[PDB]
Design an enzyme around this catalytic site. Structure first.
Site, PDB file in Angstrom:
ATOM      1  N   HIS B  41      68.722  31.790 109.818  1.00  0.00           N
ATOM      2  CA  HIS B  41      70.106  31.417 110.081  1.00  0.00           C
ATOM      3  C   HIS B  41      71.016  32.630 110.219  1.00  0.00           C
ATOM      4  CE1 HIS B  41      71.945  32.481 106.262  1.00  0.00           C
ATOM      5  NE2 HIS B  41      70.978  31.870 105.600  1.00  0.00           N
ATOM      6  N   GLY B 137      77.057  36.017 100.715  1.00  0.00           N
ATOM      7  CA  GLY B 137      76.277  37.183 101.059  1.00  0.00           C
ATOM      8  C   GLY B 137      75.044  37.401 100.217  1.00  0.00           C
ATOM      9  N   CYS B 139      72.379  35.408 100.500  1.00  0.00           N
ATOM     10  CA  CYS B 139      71.225  34.875 101.211  1.00  0.00           C
ATOM     11  C   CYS B 139      70.223  35.982 101.496  1.00  0.00           C
ATOM     12  CB  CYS B 139      71.662  34.198 102.506  1.00  0.00           C
ATOM     13  SG  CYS B 139      72.669  32.712 102.199  1.00  0.00           S
TER      14      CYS B 139
HETATM   15  C1  KKO Z   1      79.360  31.147  99.223  1.00  0.00           C
HETATM   16  O1  KKO Z   1      78.124  31.263  99.919  1.00  0.00           O
HETATM   17  C2  KKO Z   1      76.976  31.050  99.214  1.00  0.00           C
HETATM   18  C3  KKO Z   1      76.944  30.597  97.906  1.00  0.00           C
HETATM   19  C4  KKO Z   1      75.707  30.394  97.325  1.00  0.00           C
HETATM   20  N1  KKO Z   1      74.546  30.611  97.950  1.00  0.00           N
HETATM   21  C5  KKO Z   1      74.602  31.050  99.211  1.00  0.00           C
HETATM   22  C6  KKO Z   1      75.790  31.295  99.901  1.00  0.00           C
HETATM   23  C7  KKO Z   1      75.777  31.936 101.262  1.00  0.00           C
HETATM   24  O2  KKO Z   1      75.500  33.119 101.361  1.00  0.00           O
HETATM   25  N2  KKO Z   1      76.109  31.189 102.339  1.00  0.00           N
HETATM   26  C8  KKO Z   1      76.276  31.783 103.664  1.00  0.00           C
HETATM   27  C9  KKO Z   1      75.211  31.262 104.597  1.00  0.00           C
HETATM   28  N3  KKO Z   1      75.165  29.793 104.601  1.00  0.00           N
HETATM   29  C10 KKO Z   1      74.342  29.222 105.580  1.00  0.00           C
HETATM   30  C11 KKO Z   1      74.736  29.245 106.917  1.00  0.00           C
HETATM   31  C12 KKO Z   1      73.932  28.691 107.898  1.00  0.00           C
HETATM   32  C13 KKO Z   1      72.731  28.109 107.556  1.00  0.00           C
HETATM   33 CL1  KKO Z   1      71.765  27.375 108.798  1.00  0.00          CL
HETATM   34  C14 KKO Z   1      72.323  28.081 106.231  1.00  0.00           C
HETATM   35 CL2  KKO Z   1      70.790  27.414 105.785  1.00  0.00          CL
HETATM   36  C15 KKO Z   1      73.122  28.633 105.244  1.00  0.00           C
HETATM   37  C16 KKO Z   1      75.222  29.130 103.287  1.00  0.00           C
HETATM   38  C17 KKO Z   1      75.403  27.621 103.441  1.00  0.00           C
HETATM   39  O3  KKO Z   1      74.841  26.839 102.682  1.00  0.00           O
HETATM   40  N4  KKO Z   1      76.230  27.234 104.415  1.00  0.00           N
HETATM   41  C18 KKO Z   1      76.449  25.834 104.708  1.00  0.00           C
HETATM   42  C19 KKO Z   1      75.240  25.306 105.422  1.00  0.00           C
HETATM   43  C20 KKO Z   1      74.802  25.582 106.727  1.00  0.00           C
HETATM   44  C21 KKO Z   1      73.599  24.885 107.042  1.00  0.00           C
HETATM   45  C22 KKO Z   1      73.162  24.128 106.018  1.00  0.00           C
HETATM   46  S1  KKO Z   1      74.175  24.222 104.647  1.00  0.00           S
HETATM   47  C23 KKO Z   1      76.334  29.751 102.440  1.00  0.00           C
END
Ligand code: KKO
Ligand code: KKO
Lengths: 301, 295
Positions: B41, B137, B139
């Site tokens: 992603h 950030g 991930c």
């Molecule tokens: C505050 O951000 C966080 C807090 C705790 N853990 C992680 C994060 C974090 O780095 N994040 C940034 C990337 N993002 C993301 C974006 C695109 C995809 Cl496709 C996916 Cl799978 C994940 C996390 C997400 O879930 N975003 C919402 C979703 C998108 C798709 C399914 S759900 C959020």
């Protein structure tokens, strides 16, 4: 989201842990520059545990009375001295894995990560606080002494604890990196035991602010308190007295959440008098106090 | 004595973490050999094959600290990106790519800008989420176990769910759970408590001086399972009983005898007393983790 007892990455410290043997006794040493630090009770014997005279013991000792091994590489000792209750071993080679480091002496309530080693090899890392009574509730087995606790700001490791002993109660005790004990404890065979402790008040509050950030609010009430009115109640539940210095320190969490220190103090007062009515806070059924305000900001937003 | 949420030393894995930028998105990568693994992603109703076809090696900036790494290839395995780089990691340890089971623990090294922030301990919940601690950030952060010299990678952080729990893949790119890297309604399915880990946790209390919950009663394996369901616990098997044996022999408390202590607690609580400094039962300690940490 999420809130865990989080420790610092231990890599910087793993490269500093070595095995120190004196006669038939082995424990861990900390190899920093061309010097190795370890507890002085390594030079003890059976016959001496009751009242050892540590200057004699060390005078009767040669650098060759110490076997230092850094992993598979044996280290050659080229000097030996004692600072309070820590031994200082000069070795022929400075550690290239010596990180940028400091020696800090913490205050009761502060926290640190502990890298426990046996035979100079790491097993694991976890988070501790220095109790008001100068103990720590760690996880240590025979031969973990010399293990250190520590903190990290960016690239700089601040060493603040060295493991020395386990008490009848199953908590632990040790020195700063200068050899000074945290608490009224002494490296010899006496009846010393832990004195009654209190709960670290600012830390629960630091923990309560962390709960709000993560969606835990059922314990919020519409009231506020004075610091003294709060202080009266806290004593009565074996909490530490809370200061304006603590309140000032707690501000940054106040501004972020929009909850006054004393206004969150009115919630903690209510909890102490009515319990959690079964409910949890941050996945916890108790009031935690091993998180400093810094740790929350570190882990949270 | 003492019993702590103890994690593995992170040094072996710290030497593998890098900063990965793709366009305007940054997250962490795991530098192994001349290959770096990170969530796909990073390249973002999508189409990851299409998106990646439209992407060139220079669209990814990999930096190990100040050492920027040159991408010389890119491929996609399930939901993980594989970027071949011009340089193999000299701090590459002996390692494995494993995939854990619900209930199994792992250490989590949370990273930001390719720098590790901290380390802590996790369990794979039955619903294939984890109750971690992750901020923007993080991930690409990894979970893992260690057997002496070999790093067993078992998790990679991808996303956070509405409930504040998290989810990710194995290092082959297969998601743990019914979760997908796209903007959908996926949410956590009802979660259950891991009994063998609770029991393994009860043996830890005895070893460490907490014993008040020991009673003269016993139960059957079935009788206990009957009650446990009624409190939304996982069923216990003879394999779990077998798994618990070594702690039973050590403590001198029969598995099925310790089930009678746990059976009492589920229906009557701790009546206020603490166990291992906890006013609740703890199910994120495995039989191994106890043995590893204890005598
Ligand atoms: C505050 O951000 C966080 C807090 C705790 N853990 C992680 C994060 C974090 O780095 N994040 C940034 C990337 N993002 C993301 C974006 C695109 C995809 Cl496709 C996916 Cl799978 C994940 C996390 C997400 O879930 N975003 C919402 C979703 C998108 C798709 C399914 S759900 C959020
Ligand atoms: C099972 O062993 C442990 C469990 C948890 N933490 C640490 C140990 C451990 O490595 N231990 C081995 C060294 N020993 C020792 C020996 C001499 C001195 Cl002079 C001092 Cl200070 C400590 C630890 C001790 O306290 N021993 C009893 C005491 C002696 C003096 C004061 S009390 C026990």
């Amino acid at each position: 989201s999420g809130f865990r007892k989080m420790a610092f990455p231990s890599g910087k410290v793993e490269g500093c842990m070595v095995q120190v043997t004196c006669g038939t006794t082995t424990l861990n040493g900390l190899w920093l520059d061309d010097v190795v630090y370890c507890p002085r009770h390594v030079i003890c014997t059976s016959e001496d545990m009751l009242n050892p005279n540590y200057e004699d013991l060390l005078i009767r000792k040669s650098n060759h009375n110490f076997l230092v091994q850094a992993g598979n590489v044996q280290l050659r000792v080229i000097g030996h001295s004692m600072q309070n209750c820590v031994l200082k071993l000069k070795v022929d080679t400075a550690n290239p894995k010596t990180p940028k480091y400091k020696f800090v002496r913490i205050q009761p309530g502060q926290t640190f990560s502990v890298l426990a080693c046996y035979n100079g090899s790491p097993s694991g890392v976890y988070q501790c606080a220095m109790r008001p009574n100068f103990t720590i509730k760690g996880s240590f087995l025979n031969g973990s002494c010399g293990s250190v606790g520590f903190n990290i700001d960016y690239d700089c490791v601040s060493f603040c604890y060295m493991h020395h002993m386990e008490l009848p109660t199953g908590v632990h005790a040790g020195t700063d990196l200068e050899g000074n004990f945290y608490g009224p404890f002494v490296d010899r065979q006496t009846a010393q035991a832990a004195g009654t402790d209190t709960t670290i008040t600012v830390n629960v509050l630091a923990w309560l602010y962390a709960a709000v950030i993560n969606g835990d609010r059922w314990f919020l009430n519409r009231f506020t308190t004075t610091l003294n009115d709060f202080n009266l109640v806290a004593m009565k539940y074996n909490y530490e007295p809370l200061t304006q210095d603590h309140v000032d320190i707690l501000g940054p969490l106040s501004a972020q959440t929009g909850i006054a220190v004393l206004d969150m103090c009115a919630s903690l007062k209510e909890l102490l008098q009515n319990g959690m009515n079964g409910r949890t806070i941050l996945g916890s059924a108790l009031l935690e106090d091993e998180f400093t305000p810094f740790d929350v900001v570190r882990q949270c937003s």
